[PDB]
Swiss-Prot record, chains A, B:
Domain writeup: The extracellular cysteine-rich region is necessary for association with collagen, dimer formation and optimal dipeptidyl peptidase activity.
Enzyme Commission number(s): 3.4.14.5
Protein's name in the database: Dipeptidyl peptidase 4
GO CC annotation: apical plasma membrane; cell surface; endocytic vesicle; extracellular exosome; extracellular region; focal adhesion; intercellular canaliculus; lamellipodium
Main location (coarse class): membrane
Post-translational modification: The soluble form (Dipeptidyl peptidase 4 soluble form also named SDPP) derives from the membrane form (Dipeptidyl peptidase 4 membrane form also named MDPP) by proteolytic processing.
Residues annotated as catalytic: S592 (charge relay system), D670 (charge relay system), H702 (charge relay system)
Subunit structure: Monomer. Homodimer. Heterodimer with Seprase (FAP). Requires homodimerization for optimal dipeptidyl peptidase activity and T-cell costimulation. Found in a membrane raft complex, at least composed of BCL10, CARD11, DPP4 and IKBKB. Associates with collagen. Interacts with PTPRC; the interaction is enhanced in an interleukin-12-dependent manner in activated lymphocytes. Interacts (via extracellular domain) with ADA; does not inhibit its dipeptidyl peptidase activity. Interacts with CAV1 (via the N-terminus); the interaction is direct.
Reactions catalysed according to its record: Release of an N-terminal dipeptide, Xaa-Yaa-|-Zaa-, from a polypeptide, preferentially when Yaa is Pro, provided Zaa is neither Pro nor hydroxyproline
Remaining remarks: Level of plasma concentrations of the soluble form (SDPP) can be managed as a colon carcinoma diagnostic and prognostic marker.
Lineage start: Eukaryota, Metazoa, Chordata, Craniata, Vertebrata
InterPro entries to which the protein is assigned, alphabetical: AB_hydrolase_fold (IPR029058), Pept_S9_AS (IPR002471), Peptidase_S9_cat (IPR001375), Peptidase_S9B_N (IPR002469), Serine_Prot_S9B/DPPIV (IPR050278)
Outcome of mutating N54A: Does not inhibit dipeptidyl peptidase activity, interaction with ADA and homodimer formation
Main EC class the enzyme belongs to: hydrolase
Length: 728, 728
């Protein structure tokens, strides 16, 4: 009688997860948006006040896309006219609303087409980027000071990232770092003068008669990379009539002998900055610690204070060197480092000392350091019950490292095994956020004795509705391959019956440091395939996958498209043995790296798979960007790793594709994984006479995520899998 | 027979038609290559000898792509390093070989990357184009004289066409015309400075890291057109010291007032040139007659012998103003003109007098004038038996117009109903070429008494092979719609049984002045579809179609995408009535204009069609080029015909596509119908929520004709059609 979870339910979002997104603004209060009202909440007592009425700006004249309140509460930035660029970057217009008064400030407005804007950490200074140059406003109504004059579209970027830094290094458009004081503005400058341009057509609305050509500086593997410089300006000594002076901070000589990246920026105190640099060959990095000389007005970085991080087994950090967390006085810090057994744990460094001290150890990894006080360090790890796909909050007593208390493991052990967290300033309180395996649960806690204060959102509304649907369930378990555990999950049809044989869809990603088997609750395409189409959707984390130490993660070093492709295959065989999978109906699919792996598997001739779907696949590593690819594959030269570059293409395997049904899909405006990668696959298949199915999506990018395209691609894919599985 | 004509037979050319391609080199001799030997034949007596032995260039080194023998038989042009550009244009390398000395020329060679070369009509002068400039060689071993200095890639073309002139106007890359003497070289010059560029990606071999962007000056409907100038140079007065003096001949003043085209160049005598010009609104055309003033070195085009052609119902000519055929003295000419009743017939013009005299008349049309002698004019027409899809050779006695003799009608009336012809110099002999309904037949004849001399090729070898195969038959007939007859053909499966019900594939082109129902014999995809899959393949010639008078051809004027579309739908209903059609299984497909009509049809919500395939469709007329589109559609301005431009798009019909299965195919490097057109179709279907199948072919142009792609697309379409018809 009860309904199933339908494709339409997925597509139209019938069943919504409620969130509780808060922003701490002090040690005891947070802001929360509620029915477009902005409320301030007091953590200890839970009482609230309306800070911004949803009726304010009703007559503002534009739909306001976003807001940002200055730290000390005197102003609010209103973002409107948002126009998205890449994954993080975008352009917009801005108004400032004086809260003390009740006026929009009318003159010296932040310009249209501004590329980035930030408040300082304290007060109400602004820094923004417009036409690739940096500007500073001391007060919201005063004329800004121009800090840089070198900005040039597509060539010199001040205070914002170029394409490859945004996507691969900072995961952000911003390249601006205020000191905790607001006294100094640090920024990077990127120079793309000789980076080659990827070009592709954008077709736009039907009314455009000639297609547009988009051209983006974009280093493919082995190509010329952007260069970077780092500067710090004193925002307290700006002059109306004198250009502002930026002091440059140069990379360490061991970086200057070749191509290198600036990869981390972190203020330690009001007068100390930490910079991390990374060689183009990403197995060697340097942390520089630079102090302000108030007499010189200059910045010096003592070589004695440098810290070096090397890898023998692979690359530095999971995707990049980890962030250091400085003690209050700035003379020491903690960061995650891979230990001698290859597990990532918390290491304590002292700035004038050479080696660090491990504060944690064991056959599990620290995921992130979340907070630090003088008595305790709080971190997320997957230690609980030895499950790599679980996540919990722990605290370590800094006076006795043997005293670790888990703060989340036992709160709600059946419902909650995957936590993330958000601490107020000075770590007086924290919000816990459980993501599964039960429905997401948001709770507020006091750090004093780690006492629960109250439930913030328990998603009871969603619970009511789902009691009316036949939901699939999820199994998280492991198999053994050559003496080692590798984890998988299965999304199982409702009323699962291990005596019947089900079709199986292998959902893959398997890029380096990926994890597809975990304890989080999701409502997605797979929910539909299991609930309505009675398909099992499996995912497997093989060699190359993360959060289980370097032996596993680095197995793939200089060898992309090998072990992680074989392992997805062997996992599929082992699934086939289990007595509830029809071995005649095994499919595979994935997006991006998942599309690469899907294609390499389908072209392996294993005979294990009936059909597969690759969406926006990499096909050849020379086509993808330098920073991501070289991190794992080194350089595509005869002296380095050219030979596995050439050995790991989808194209070289065209012939074996005649054994399977293949659907190939790609967006024509994909700035990230270029349509090119897919166009070379289809051409190789044609050359060898293999029939297959294709679908391009006009003007969609890597995400294929406009509402209509998103509905369309999943509708198309369902049909393909239904037909491949002889489902009616 | 047991065996059928298979997809593989089509794809791999199991059964080849033999041809007999000769070139006349005088009034009674022709060259014909047998094996790789070049033979010279004597037409009167049929005897022959080897002109050039196949073993002459074994040591030449390069693969010779083609050859051209000079008129006086002394030299031969060898063409290698052939590189195709658009439909007619290409670059190549050239060697010249002295036939008397029996040695290759080594001094003053024709440059690499030459764009066009042509002997003078007499003797052995050479004119060629290189880097967009014209050069002339008096002797094959002497330095060439440079004629123009203005050539610049993609901007100034001397002696060759730009894109839209090659494709839509001259159907040729060449824009050079030797006078009959070889004394004068006339050439056109095209100026693309302000013509917008169409841009698209070319991906090339896998090894190319960054896709290349192709850029071509291409006027879309309504955009700035290239401009043209016309020049004549005296080749007998060239100096190695002084520059070549090119005399310009300017368009008439009635053309100069706005945008216009040079549409035809014809030498009449040694000192008389004919130029036809065409207004950009292509219902107005002017023919100039220009004479050399020997005493001034100038060319004068007097208005006394200027002729005007206008249309009130449509455009001028079938695709352009027809060619003039001058009598020997240059004082008069014959050309095809639409008469008072809208049928195209031969008209007699006397240079300095008004009007012309029609010398043919009737309900039918002359397809072309083929040859002109002192006594007779030879032309092809579809008079015979009132079949508009047949072609026959006639001659009209010049001294008495009522004396018309059909020369081909009765040669073999059951095998042969579609002839073309090739006359020798001065029309002493002609080769007849019959293309259907039976197997092709080549014969030689003499003009004196129209005696049949001998058979050249009768395709007996093909004949015996096909006797062993179950071949389809071809039905050619008409339905009456109003009081008008409209012709159609059916390719019928072997052992056709009118009591059975067969699935039907409507094969459409249906562009202006097209004809898809004729008596030609073809071995193509439809053959496979009828012979092996027992599918009926029908084509219908409705309103807009040619060779049946203006009333029918012009019906579509300024309204593309209406009657020709409706009529295809109406034909299928008629076909449905006929009791041998399963009206639950009717499909449609077409390429280019057929792709556009197919989609308009599928988007009409008519319910007659289950599925259809569009290959490289036009989707919106603003996307296609100015010369073709504007010819039928006028300009897309509010004051002209913008409303129907906007009413006749495929995109506006997307909603109705949810009623049919649709396959959309396009090549990414299509320089003619830009991929843009299908890119916008799929986008409209996505935005509307309609599922469909698609396939791009990377780096393929409009013909998708690389042998791997050609095999692939037809294999893909075959699978699609067989599933739509449930044909196991
Ligand atoms: C697929 N998403 C492409 C192709 C391979 C994985 C490279 N990839 C990326 O887009 C990367 N830039 C990602 C995006 C995101 C954050 C980082 C890790 C990642 O696994 C997920 C890949 C960099
Ligand atoms: C597809 N055939 C495209 C799109 C519309 C029909 C116009 N077309 C052409 O390619 C034209 N340039 C043609 C090519 C060839 C010779 C001329 C008449 C034509 O019907 C066949 C179309 C111009
Ligand atoms: C954000 C908020 O409302 N906090 C209030 C605080 O301002 C007030 O002083 C206190 C006493 O009533 O109650 C609490
Ligand atoms: C500083 C600035 O550019 N302000 C502009 C304003 O002048 C303009 O009227 C509006 C629309 O573009 O956007 C904002
Ligand atoms: C503002 C800036 O630094 N631009 C530089 C430019 O001076 C230099 O010529 C080029 C060569 O790499 O690199 C970039
Ligand atoms: C092309 C050819 O072979 N023509 C020959 C001709 O050269 C010759 O003079 C004649 C001899 O009778 O026979 C004929
Ligand atoms: C006629 C001419 O220029 N010949 C050239 C030859 O010299 C050259 O070696 C070859 C490769 O570039 O191309 C051809
Ligand atoms: C050789 C030639 O004709 N070049 C012309 C140029 O002089 C003119 O400025 C341009 C503008 O249309 O067109 C082109
Ligand atoms: C024979 C002679 O004078 N040569 C000229 C050359 O100098 C000049 O550059 C060109 C026009 O640009 O015309 C030619
Ligand atoms: C009055 C009228 O035009 N009715 C029909 C029309 O619908 C059709 O298009 C035409 C030719 O088929 O025959 C007539």
């Amino acid at each position: 009688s009860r309904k199933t979870y339908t494709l339409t339910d997925y597509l139209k979002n019938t069943y919504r997860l409620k969130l509780y997104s808060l922003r701490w603004i002090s040690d005891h209060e947070y802001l929360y948006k509620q029915e477009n009202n902005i409320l301030v909440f007091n953590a200890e007592y839970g009482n609230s006040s309306v800070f911004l009425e949803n009726s304010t700006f009703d007559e503002f004249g534009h739909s306001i896309n976003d807001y940002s309140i200055s730290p000390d509460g005197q102003f609010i930035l209103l973002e409107y006219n948002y126009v998205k660029q890449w994954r993080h970057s975008y352009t917009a217009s801005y108004d400032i609303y004086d809260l003390n008064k009740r006026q929009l400030i009318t003159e010296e407005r932040i310009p249209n087409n501004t590329q980035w804007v930030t408040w300082s950490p304290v007060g109400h200074k602004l820094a923004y980027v417009w036409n690739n140059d940096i500007y500073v406003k001391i007060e919201p109504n005063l004329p800004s000071y121009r800090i840089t004059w070198t900005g040039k579209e597509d060539i010199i970027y001040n205070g914002i990232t170029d394409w490859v830094y945004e996507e691969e290094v900072f995961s952000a458009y911003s390249a601006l770092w205020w000191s905790p004081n607001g006294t100094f503005l640090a920024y990077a400058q990127f120079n793309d003068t000789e980076v080659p341009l990827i070009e592709y057509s954008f077709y736009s609305d039907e009314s455009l008669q000639y297609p547009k050509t988009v051209r983006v500086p974009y280093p493919k593997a082995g190509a010329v990379n952007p260069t970077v410089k780092f500067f710090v300006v004193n925002t307290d000594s700006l002059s109306s009539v004198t250009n502002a002076t930026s002091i440059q901070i140069t990379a360490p000589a061991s970086m200057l002998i070749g191509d290198h990246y600036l990869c981390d920026v972190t203020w330690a105190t009001q007068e100390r900055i930490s910079l991390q640099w990374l060689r183009r060959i990403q197995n060697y990095s340097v942390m520089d610690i630079c102090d302000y000389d108030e007499s010189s007005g200059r910045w010096n970085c003592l070589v004695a204070r440098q810290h070096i991080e090397m890898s023998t087994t692979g690359w530095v950090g999971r995707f990049r060197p980890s962030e250091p967390h400085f003690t209050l006085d700035g003379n020491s810090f903690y960061k995650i480092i891979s230990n001698e057994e290859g597990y990532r744990h918390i290491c304590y460094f002292q700035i004038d000392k050479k080696d660090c001290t491990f504060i944690t150890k064991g056959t599990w990894e620290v995921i992130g350091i979340e907070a630090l006080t003088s008595d305790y360090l709080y971190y997320i790890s997957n230690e609980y019950k030895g499950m790599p796909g679980g996540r919990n909050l722990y605290k370590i007593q800094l006076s006795d490292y043997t005293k670790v208390t888990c703060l989340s493991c036992e709160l709600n052990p059946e419902r909650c095994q995957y936590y993330s967290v958000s601490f107020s300033k000075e770590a007086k309180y924290y919000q816990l956020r459980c993501s599964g395996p039960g429905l997401p649960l948001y709770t507020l806690h006091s750090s004093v004795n780690d006492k629960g204060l109250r439930v913030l959102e328990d998603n009871s509304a969603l619970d009511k509705m789902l009691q009316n649907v036949q939901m699939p369930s999820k199994k998280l378990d492991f198999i053994i391959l050559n003496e080692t555990k590798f984890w998988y999950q299965m999304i199982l049809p409702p009323h699962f019956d291990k005596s019947k044989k089900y079709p199986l869809l292998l959902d893959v990603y398997a890029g380096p440091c990926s994890q597809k088997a975990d304890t989080v609750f999701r409502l997605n395409w797979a929910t539909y395939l299991a609930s309505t189409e009675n398909i099992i959707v499996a995912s497997f984390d093989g060699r190359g996958s993360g959060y289980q130490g370097d032996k596993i993660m680095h197995a793939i070093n200089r060898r992309l498209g090998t072990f992680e492709v074989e392992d997805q295959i062997e996992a599929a065989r082992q699934f086939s043995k289990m007595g509830f999978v029809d071995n005649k109906r095994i499919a595979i699919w994935g997006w991006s790296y998942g599309g690469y792996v899907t294609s390499m598997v389908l072209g392996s001739g294993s005979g294990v798979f009936k059909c597969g779907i690759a969406v926006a696949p990499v096909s050849r590593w020379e086509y993808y960007d330098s920073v991501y690819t070289e991190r794992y594959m080194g350089l595509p030269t005869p002296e380095d790793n050219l030979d596995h570059y050439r050995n790991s293409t989808v194209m070289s395997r065209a012939e074996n594709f005649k054994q399977v049904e293949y659907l190939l899909i790609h967006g024509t405006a994909d700035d990230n994984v270029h349509f090119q990668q897919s166009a070379q696959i289809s051409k190789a298949l044609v050359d060898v006479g293999v029939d297959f199915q294709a679908m391009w999506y006009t003007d969609e990018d890597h995400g294929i995520a406009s509402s209509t395209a998103h509905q369309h691609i999943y509708t198309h894919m369902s049909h393909f899998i239904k037909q491949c599985f002889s489902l009616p």
